[model samples]
Target: VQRYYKTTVPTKPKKPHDISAFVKSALPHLSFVVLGHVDAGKSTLMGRLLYDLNIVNQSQLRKLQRRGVTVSICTSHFSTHRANFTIVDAPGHRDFVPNAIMGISQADMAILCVDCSTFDLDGQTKEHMLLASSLGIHNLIIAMNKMDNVDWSQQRFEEIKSKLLPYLVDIGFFEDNINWVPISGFSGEGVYKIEYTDEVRQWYNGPNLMSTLENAAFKISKENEGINKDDPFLFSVLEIIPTSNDLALVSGKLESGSIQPGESLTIYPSEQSCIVDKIQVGSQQHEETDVAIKGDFVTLKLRKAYPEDIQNGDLAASVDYSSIHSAQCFVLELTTFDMNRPLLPGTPFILFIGVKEQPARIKRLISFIDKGNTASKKKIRHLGSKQRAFVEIELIEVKRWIPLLTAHENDRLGRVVLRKDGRTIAAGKISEITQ
Candidate 1:
């Protein structure tokens, strides 16, 4: 059984029912976020693919060449005669990664665009993958890009796949769930697959990149499906876009429940109450709707202006779950990804729970459990990189948590990322919570 925080107060308790997500899902609408190292053909790949699909005009690509336009991460949807999918092109550079974090948070799947010529994976490449998996994103498809550079050799694609298998497995991604796709997004070799093109087709006879994506299903884990989807209401604020009308328009994913127009939403920590005046699930401005549900990226506009105390890293949830605000400390099951030194009690870290980033400390070293599924344990003093253990964390005096976190056992909300000095030190799941 999964553990819960046992809030000091109560709200409308959640009940369970099997969800037919595949049938109830919004059709053909999916978000695929791209990741890789800088200059790994990410921009060139997407730009050319969109052009081939005739989604965006050449003038847009021409405009993209200057400054930040190319990596625009154009959130709008594109429709081809065949099918359509929402695409988010994230910047591969580490500096721009913070903003990119939200991109993957709402993504149903990921496209790992690796340049085929690289002798090894970029340090940031693994970091991006680590960040995504920690956020509870499991669907992974590889864009073995830059095939033209390596002369479209099948062996080269297979070789890269072999090297990546161990790392992927360590992060909980199994071999079967991962799909390798060969493509030259720059030359448009495998994307739309310029049909009469002979050189690239010599060794490649399978489905093109676009078809692979079309066939892929956007799926939710059984654990997250019930807890989040069955909630009364839960949504995390990603950005605070102030409107001219003195109202604030916040955009974020609905972790659970469904929201509609004129409904009351209680902000966490500050406990401010606001009404949803408008909502647009996607980037399209005029696409405002009457209701939104779990897995939807929505723009919720407050009916009136908010208080100065109300800001980002705040959650807007149903007032019924006010007890969620009681959590002041957390105990977690964590593993250091790149922290080279052993972790000690009271170690300082910036705890990132979705949109919430707070100053926190390792309250204490609990016990180190064996990697096996057994509860067999060994008490530990320090934890090195890749070492798994149970640890307690206490948030520094702060209000407003952008995330409405749950037991890591329950859903992605329970996961947290620890970072310092622009590097991720650890990623973990919440085991216990306290008021």
Candidate 2:
């Protein structure tokens, strides 16, 4: 599905909007992904926090308790007077890491859940750390969970922090960006309030987890590096809600620019077009808005497009400024993780990029990057563990074309994660594209 359109439309669709003003307004919003190993209590911790905030009522809690562990990316929302927060509870099991990555793709930051009872980083946890770092998640909250099981031992907290710090710093997480708090999701200590736990109070005097999130000073404009709100509108389809044959509701995070009612958009990969009938933002779709800006999760009632006309992972853009392009092959400057054998051309992997998943293969091993003290740095034939290299990859789908941007053009859309056998093998940004 390839589409192109050249039509004129107003660059400013609605009343002038101010980005900084929104941040300073009554309730600034922040979205974060929860990540850790299996049974790390991510869902429990977030669910407890949501319940404490009165966002999840009593009956909902009972239903969640029975579910035990989250299988897919689960989303919930809570808010304080100071700010609104969205938490995406990403599954911690190795089998569901792709879902986890997908969750991270939409988050502004991350909350890493650690099981203090074990005081050990599971393989999945380590990979999650690496993937989050590679995917460009800067802000992190280290939830040293299960503290009640260990008697809220400060020594255990220190030990886990020591183990995680070096690796986190090595992977490019700034020391200032990482926030640490010890808590027990079950007992509710350090999550909403810490007064009930004497052991936690004995050693810790910092703000509770909820306060930390509420008080976090997020520079929304700075974090969104490549999003040009003045550019053409771009929205990646996350889900398609079918209504009638000629109309449907499409929900996703706006990647660039802004849109308002009556705006015409060119739906990609199908060459179909539709006009925006209405705009609803946030988890609750009660209120309609005049304009939806970049980074806002929105659902638009589209006119003239059927349920089959749009699919998840497809992109939509304003017709006049539709800079989106589709490609079948591209070059990736990727850093690969440990594997059973070196990576070779023709090795198949699942490519995760911009809300899209498809079969892909390593087309060619270009060259190894010089990461200081490497014996040879060019024309590498194979890729080993923890090596940075430039390689070519080809999309396996014959009729499908994927909308992709280079890291320089749009970092969020350009990021890529490669998975094999349920393990995230590598992560990189697109450097070039070739059809």
Candidate 3:
């Protein structure tokens, strides 16, 4: 009887059903941000891409074209036979740099659109490129826009490339990781591989912008791409909209693990616990789904979740089952950008990590490696721009603590950017947390 009973018992437990696995595996999904200077035609290029891909209707495209400029971040989705995409269009004005960085922080790649007709690296152009580099974005597609204005002149294209490539390489972009293509954002030349006019056909026969994007050799690792649904749940709150007295809608990317309705989650720092009521995956239409996994941009409606209780920059995880931690102090591996003044200890900065920006100060400078000079370490009174170093940071508010993880543990949570006096000073990754 004992032997028969043992034979009937199952040894393995069943796995939960994953509804989106088939959809995820059907095509490679990449989210890329458009970065450039103001009037570099970033928004127009975005409209053209959407129109070409049939994601936007003619009337909508016309409206988008007529819009003067994009003041805030805009996102649109399109798919090709080769892959799926989430295109984030970032505003290029210097005043909106923070908005741009927010978009860049969530992207897998970047489209550095440059105005080839009057090609000079503008303030926002340089700042955007530097920010993308420091944010760990490796894959770059440099679009020499406005080529039609130059009559599709191959020399103009080469001239721009000659001037831009050196600076890009110097700023840590790998030569092979960067791809160049000439495009006319308004005229739609070289945007897609449709029939090219004689002027364009005579000189350039390279792959079009869409083809390059579809076939992009992205360097994002499998681990970074995150298909592990069983890992601990982690979500960064991007925005919060109050729906009712007992509920609120929160939108953000699921950084790790998976979540389902009815599961309880805790908001970090706030420690507010709530239950997931519903999940929406798309932007325009809220489509219900059974599960949301890592890398999915989801809008979660929470039961009894209030806008006041949970705000942007808050982290969410499984109640009492999360690996994410909150800390008041941490160490960072930093590389500075050009600044008029040198950095001294106790310099105040608005440190941006994930969706959170906290008022922080440099507590100590541990070591320094100068970038402008021959590679060497030295004891310095103050750190200058374009230098690398390790520094200790602490939140200005004594009691404040934020969810932070080492770069080795979580890529999104570990990265940070520092800005002061309305300009970016440096960017780095968290190396350690001080207990």
Candidate 4:
């Protein structure tokens, strides 16, 4: 019988801690975030994969039964002697776009679930493209799920594949890069193992999902090749914690380059410079460290800085101050959920990208483009609420610009959620900027 491991909280070690040393000694592990539209069988696919891999035993399955979580978002991890897998299951509803973006931003690759029988090929395709592009996810597997519902019709499969090809190409995925495998999560047709015959999907000639995932190269763009090792140390503040001294503690992941002890760096937006007095993770301190490279989570002791100066949502970089803008006006490809009413000017909504949140107004609806396959631009003054159109966004308040800037530098600026009256009504990416 296969043994199952339950989730446990990590405990602090009594001995001294050295994150850099630990990281260097351990084998690198690949992490992936599973994403899809609501009820697209993301959790089901994950459960199936884990079960087939023997990562989850009968005991854990019974534990799940007792939790009454038959259908909810859950995370699972599996590790082999060779590689470790961390899978984050994310919600698909529009309200959870923020969570989805957060999850995708930290992933090395993504498994995008598509309910083949129920997916509106014309409607949700743009959102999928925008999400993948905005998160800088190049490695993806389009699991064409629910093939059992359609009786595995070859003609239906071809129809959907034909519609998806152009959009996939437009999003920078070539025929050789992406694998579209027809599957059925309910019937255990074509996932995990690929013994299913093509007689069920005559037109689908792609490799089985398991082989494709195993052979595909998954990587993080931030850690990709051609990175400037000599570039200035730059990090984004993910959270801020208060310490005993008047000085505030800043915690964040290092984005790129490096920072050495006693190096002077500038906090972004505020543009205040301070010397790094100490570096610590948990209770351990590295005073003589030379360089803090990318992906290291570290807290810094500043020479002199104010709490207001180092906000939670700020950027820290080498003393050379870069231009920071609070508010930006950009052209967005809007995909609305409401189909009956046109999206009109003065539509108030909440704009969420990265860690910033602010009220925004649609200044104008430019035009209605193509309904399916991909989003296009047209010339129009107004748009129905359910329409897919291009529009201008005007921010109502000040928020940190680092996340957006980070996304911009990395080609991830397109993932955003637009909410109105506490409900997410639309989702899209910034297509262009007028400013």
Candidate 5:
């Protein structure tokens, strides 16, 4: 017993090169997710964009003006570059953190909608950015919204930018890809149109939000030169419904590859295979298609899977399988946020990955990382709130549906959110699968 240590290596079901690429979108696909604290004008600017482009009528816009619109999306075909864009407006409340990750995970770029009038970079602002950047979304559009409250002051713009520049840069955002556009959500200035008042025109003569968004690069690198349709088809089954004895409805997004009607796919967790009989896209209002591409929120009619066999966040793969298994344990490189206590090992907390939520526990702290200094990290028994480090987690309940991967390129789809008693305590990406 004292002579050696034992380790385990899971089977490899699909070799890395077994899958290949296909075109997801015919046009340049630009998907943007809006993020910020509540009342930060995240939804307002997105709603205004739909109205400005005539995608939503005044009747539809007025219904949501007094209340709120979270998780809203509208696609358009306008751009000097002939690019197509989809903007997702997500809710900021803590309970909806799962939905938040789902939106950011699928986006190519992000719009950090900051309320310039009373801007303080804390709370959900930091949480959303930490999650987004961890997923490799570097191209950002800082819509310094609500500038009208301060009369579009140039001094105020410079002040906020100076303070936020370091935080954004430290998290791997470069200046060239981040376009700061002064905007007012009320009058719809600088959002989709450039009705820049004379006061704003003198100080801010930059490109309007639409132009900045269109020209911005969506993929992170040249290797991902286009939307990631070339990779194998990766989708997480979001919901399941039954229509008849042999038909079931499945809704989810194609995180990486392409799918066509009549293609065969394997549903995970249950490990059951089925043929895709029908396909439909969300919000496009188009007829049933023979094919669906990457980044499309879609619905599929499976040949014969039961309603109870699948649930939300169950990943379905079209590539080779037999190695994919339920993720019960994993490792992470995490940056803790403000909380009431330290993150000690063996303590129970809520883990949100994509649209899936489950009770999980911190198994161990592999190392600790000083926020700014990379070399100061060390192995520790536990991590405290506001500390950045690498840690391991084990799912305590509802563990079977969550999937894990080893590729670094899947980081965007591999973000983790830790919450305790309804409050977000830490956020980061899954660094590896220790299990």
Candidate 6:
């Protein structure tokens, strides 16, 4: 007798590709990260945006509902005549802060969501904004979500705006530069279009969320318009893949101008140079293709370089390279996970910048500024689980060549992550590089 048990298999959703005609056109690619407190409608806003743009079909929407994986980090893409926009939907909960930071670090701009129906700004929301601002993300759009819950009352909207203004100003966001648009993700109001009869935001006359983003400066063409091959080739190795042909493929997004076949390049942190044997994407090799522009991802093949000669986190450039030693003392804005614990001096943590991760020690007990006052200076070792502060970092070991700010000015690679005991505790950017 043959007895068989039932098999239950889980199926992964098919990965979608760019529509054929869409990819061929030169569409400006603007990457954005959605951030906010949990239940602030980050994922719902993304879903609604995709729906409004006709990127998701009815069947796919149903599948999304069935999955019930709301408030998680997911990436989605939509195409417009001007550009192909990619949005990274990030979790707004405290536990998922690490994932949110990673997503935000890769974005060119950010959409900060806030629930107008809710009370004061939560700790998580403040932490998110602090991280974004400290990481040099100057472009921001605030989505005052869930306006329908309050019956679209103009008074309530004003109240929400008044309460958040001070906090926004303290975080270094100027009122003129920031655009706030009231929206209801559930009812599809004030998102893609401003309702004429909507009295909820009588004082607000800014463009709707989508329109504001479409008009905002999302890409820096001066830095992204292909590398200047004439300048010294300055490339950072982000990832290394071993090929079937027993060759190591060095892959990284170009932080500056282009590279071509037969060009000589130098590897930094070691000061080595080699001739480019080929340039390939997947298996195809190109000799006279377009210059590899800034923000464009590519892999380079060397004529006589061994896999062991190069490693992840190493920087490469043209032979005419300038040497700048990694800094031992640099100021960093601390975005803590716990607000109750005060971050003190002499703490040990791991600092991740670009593709390099190394041990670091916090030595100075900088004064914590609260409400524009320097509170105290104590030798505290740890911070409240979700607090934000500023401190200095001392390196344990130098591992990679730090790229100049002008070389790869994109924020994606500029942001850094801080971890303690195998878990990420904070994130920041290199504001000052000490000589």
Best by TM-score: 2
Per-residue error (Å), model 6, residue 407: 11
lDDT of 5 by residue, 136-222 (tens): 677888999899898888889999999898889876689977889988988889987547887778888898788777666344222
lDDT of 5: 0.68
**Separate clash counts for every candidate:** 1, 1, 0, 11, 2, 19
**Deviation of model 4 at 372, angstroms:** 20
Model 2, 1-435: lDDT tens per residue? 244333455434445545445333435567788887657788788778878878778788767764211122445666676676777656666677777777888787888888888445767788888878777788888888888788888888899899888888987699999889988877787888444466557678887787777666345644443334457678878777633546778877777776777777877777677777789876674878776667677788887775565677778887776456778889898888877777899999999885568899999988787863243546677899988888899889655777777877777778898888877788888988875
33 in model 4: Cα distance from truth in Å? 2.8
Q: Which of 1 and 6 is the better model by TM-score?
A: 1
Task: Mark the 10 consecutive residues where model 4 has the least summed lDDT.
Answer: 1-10
RMSD of 3: 7.6
Best by lDDT: 2
Estimated TM-score per prediction?
0.81, 0.86, 0.82, 0.60, 0.78, 0.67
| Model 5 misplaced stretches (Cα beyond 4 Å) | 1-25, 37-39, 59-81, 94-99, 134-136, 194-203, 217-230, 241-245, 282-286, 321-323, 368-379, 385-389, 399-401, 407-409
By lDDT rank, best first, the candidates go 2, 3, 5, 1, 6, 4
Task: Residues 360-419, candidate 3: write the lDDT tens digits.
Answer: 998888888555323356786777888888888888874456777788777767899899
Residue by residue across 125-226, what tens digits does model 4's lDDT show?
355555555455677778887777787776776778787777777655677656677787765567764457657645566666665565452233224233
Alpha carbon lDDT of residue 212, candidate 2?
73
Report residue 168 deviation for candidate 1 (angstroms). Answer: 1.5
Clashing pairs in 2: 1-269
lDDT (Cα, tens digit) per residue for candidate 6, span 1-435? 132111122111123222222224344556678888657877677767777777777577556542111222244556565555656555667786666665565466788888877458887788778766655567788898888787766678788878787778877678877777888887667776335344544666667777777766334543444333344455766455553432445665555545666565666544455555456542232632334444444567665455565665566665555542446777665556533334567777877665455788887756453543344565445556655555677777665544433213334444676777655577655545554
RMSD of each: 6.2, 4.1, 7.6, 10.6, 7.2, 11.8
TM-score of 2: 0.86
Error at 150, model 4, angstroms: 8.1
